[PDB]
Amino acid sequence: GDIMLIILTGLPGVGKSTFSKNLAKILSKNNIDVIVLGSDLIRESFPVWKEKYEEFIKKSTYRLIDSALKNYWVIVDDTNYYNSMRRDLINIAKKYNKNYAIIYLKASLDVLIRRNIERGEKIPNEVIKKMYEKFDEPGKKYKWDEPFLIIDTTKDIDFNEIAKKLIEKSKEIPKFNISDKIDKETRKIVSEYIKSKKLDKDKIKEVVELRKEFLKKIKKVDADRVLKEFKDLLNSY
Amino acid sequence: MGDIMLIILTGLPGVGKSTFSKNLAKILSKNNIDVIVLGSDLIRESFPVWKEKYEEFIKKSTYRLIDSALKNYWVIVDDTNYYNSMRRDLINIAKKYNKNYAIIYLKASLDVLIRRNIERGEKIPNEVIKKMYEKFDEPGKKYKWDEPFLIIDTTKDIDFNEIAKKLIEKSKEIPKFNNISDKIDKETRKIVSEYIKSKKLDKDKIKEVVELRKEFLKKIKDADRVLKEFKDLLNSY
Q: Domains of chain B by range and CATH? A: 1-178 (3.40.50.300), 179-237 (1.10.12.40)
Q: How far is CA B154 from CA B105, B113, B157, in A?
A: 10, 11, 7
- CB-CB under 8 Å, A68 with B47: no
Torsion region of B105: left, alpha or beta (phi above 0 gives left; psi -120 to 50 gives alpha) = beta
Q: Select from B29, B48, B69 the Cβ nearest to the Cβ of A47.
A: B29
Query: Are the C-beta atoms of A60 and A42 separated by less than 8 Å?
Result: yes
Phi, psi of A74 (to 5 degrees): -130, 130
- CB-CB under 8 Å, A28 with B43: no
All residues of chain B having their beta carbon less than 8 Å from the beta carbon of residue A48 are 29
Beta strand pairing status for A4-9 and A99-106?
parallel
What was the structure determination method? X-ray
Q: Sheet containing A149-152: which strands, arranged edge to edge? A: A34-37, A73-76, A4-9, A99-106, A149-152
Name the nearest CA neighbour of A162 among A51, A1, A57, A6: A6
Rounded Cα distance between A219 and A199, Å, is: 27
- CB-CB under 8 Å, A35 with B46: yes
- CB-CB under 8 Å, B64 with A67: yes
Chain A positions touching chain B (beta carbons under 8 Å): 21, 24-25, 27-28, 33-37, 41-42, 45-48, 50, 53, 56, 60, 63-64, 67-68, 71-72
Reported resolution, Å: 2.5
All residues of chain B having their beta carbon less than 8 Å from the beta carbon of residue A60 are 65, 68-69
Q: Select from A28, A63, A68 the Cβ nearest to the Cβ of B48.
A: A28
Question: Which letter does DSSP use for residue B2 in this model?
Answer: -
A137: helix, strand or coil: coil
- Three-state SS for B82-100 is CCHHHHHHHHHHHHHHCCE
* Sign of the dihedral through C-alpha B22, B27, B29, B34: negative
Name the nearest CA neighbour of A207 among A235, A179, A183: A235
Q: Sheet containing B74-77: which strands, arranged edge to edge? A: B35-38, B74-77, B5-10, B100-107, B150-153
Query: Are the C-beta atoms of B83 and B182 separated by less than 8 Å?
Result: yes
Rounded Cα distance between B96 and B108, Å, is: 33
Return the H-helix or E-strand segment holding B77: strand B74-77
Q: Is A105 exposed, middle or buried (0-12, 13-18, 19+ CB in 10 A)?
A: buried
Closest alpha carbon within chain A to B66: A60
Rounded Cα distance between B184 and A191, Å, is: 48
All residues of chain A having their beta carbon less than 8 Å from the beta carbon of residue B33 are none
Q: How far is CA B139 from CA A89, B80, B112, B135, B148, in A?
A: 42, 12, 20, 13, 7
- CB-CB under 8 Å, A67 with B61: yes
Residue B12, marked binder? yes
In this structure, which long-range contacts are made by residues A208-214, counting pairs with CB atoms below 8 Å and at least 24 apart in sequence? A208/A126, A208/A127, A208/A130, A210/A234, A210/A237, A211/A186, A211/A187, A214/A186
Residue B17, marked binder? yes
Amino acid at A91: N
